[PDB]
Every structure is written in structure tokens, then in C-alpha cells.
Amino acid sequence: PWRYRLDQFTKEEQTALGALAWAFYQQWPAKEQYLGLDLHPQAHFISCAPQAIAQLNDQVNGRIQEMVGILYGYDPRTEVAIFVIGPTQFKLLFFQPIPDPASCFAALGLTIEELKHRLEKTLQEKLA
């Protein structure tokens, strides 16, 4: 069950996802881009524009409206919001890591590339 696997992935890799989210927030401080995750054909992080997400919600007739609100409204300084494109539907990873995303980035010491590379391999292994 891919949705369940993502939920466990969020808990198991809470720190690394906090670090990746913080680095992405620094690159896009005005939330011009949302951190994305496409599972097809392989799990890899992407960048989603709010226009693209709005169009995606139009294609589904408002069924991901609450994801659009959370993406608009979430606070990157404490909250992680990752948009996941699944094979059957969309999923939003929404949580507050402990410690805060900036502290996660500081504790790990990894760059954004090493964070994506480490996390994508881990997620790909869990999905199969």
C-alpha cells in the first residue's frame, strides 16, 4: 500500500525531510515553488509551481482543494508540506518535524543534492 508506505516514510525520515524542506525553502523563500514528489516511474523530488497545482486541482474539479490551501497557508519555518503525485491519486505530506526544519538541516550537514539522493533511494527501496 503506497499511501501507508509514504506515511511510515514521513515518520522514519522525519529529520532528513525536515532538512530537505528547509533547504528548499531557502531556495524559494516566497513559496514560488512547492516541494514535490513524483512516484512514477521512480520516486524523485520535483518542483511544483502554484499555477501547476491550481491547474491540477482544476483537472480534478476541486478534489485536492484542501491541499491547495495547506500549500498556500503552511509555515515553512516549522511545517513541511510535500506534494506527492501517486499512481492512483495525490497525497500531501504535512507535518512539523522535531526539531524545527532549520535545526534538522544544521544537525545533518548534508547539502540539498545529498538530501534528495539519500531520500529518493530510501523511498524507492520502501515502495518496490
Side-chain angles (χ1 to χ4, degrees):
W2 68 277
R3 293 165 290 184
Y4 165 82
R5 301 295 188 181
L6 268 299
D7 284 356
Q8 298 291 97
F9 173 73
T10 293
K11 309 187 81 176
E12 291 170 10
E13 297 289 329
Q14 176 238 218
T15 309
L17 291 168
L20 179 59
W22 175 252
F24 187 91
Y25 166 59
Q26 296 298 289
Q27 292 185 351
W28 305 99
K31 290 201 293 189
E32 323 89 282
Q33 295 290 318
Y34 298 137
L35 180 53
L37 195 51
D38 191 353
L39 304 188
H40 172 81
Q42 85 289 4
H44 65 296
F45 291 97
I46 61 167
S47 289
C48 311
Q51 296 87 340
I53 302 305
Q55 177 181 5
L56 246 48
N57 183 67
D58 292 351
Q59 298 175 359
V60 85
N61 278 320
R63 291 194 285 184
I64 60 162
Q65 259 292 327
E66 196 77 335
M67 295 187 191
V68 178
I70 297 174
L71 282 174
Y72 271 138
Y74 85 91
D75 191 329
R77 294 172 292 156
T78 61
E79 304 173 328
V80 180
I82 303 174
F83 188 75
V84 179
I85 309 179
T88 57
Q89 62 202 25
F90 309 104
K91 194 195 209 309
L92 187 70
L93 308 180
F94 179 58
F95 66 100
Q96 294 179 3
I98 294 173
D100 62 287
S103 301
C104 294
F105 185 78
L108 255 49
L110 305 176
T111 191
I112 189 168
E113 289 298 292
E114 297 172 31
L115 283 170
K116 292 171 189 169
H117 259 298
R118 192 178 95 88
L119 286 169
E120 282 162 356
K121 171 214 165 58
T122 298
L123 184 52
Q124 285 162 2
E125 180 69 21
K126 303 298 146 55
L127 293 183

